[PDB]
Amino acid sequence: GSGSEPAVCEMCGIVGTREAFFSKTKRFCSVSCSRSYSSNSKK
Ligand SMILES: [Zn+2]
């Protein structure tokens, strides 16, 4: 977590830089992907 760590989306797969991905969790490119992976799946 310094320069621009990559955060891959478990839902869509899209990968980006922490400062570009959802700061909330960072695991998903969007909050929807969070409520979706949670309300539609489990890990
Ligand atoms: Zn996504």
Side-chain angles (χ1 to χ4, degrees), residues 6-31:
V8 192
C9 189
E10 290 289 300
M11 206 252 227
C12 319
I14 312 130
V15 191
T17 71
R18 39 125 76 188
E19 52 117 84
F21 253 64
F22 206 43
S23 291
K24 202 139 254 218
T25 37
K26 229 80 105 301
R27 268 145 70 159
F28 313 96
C29 61
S30 87
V31 61

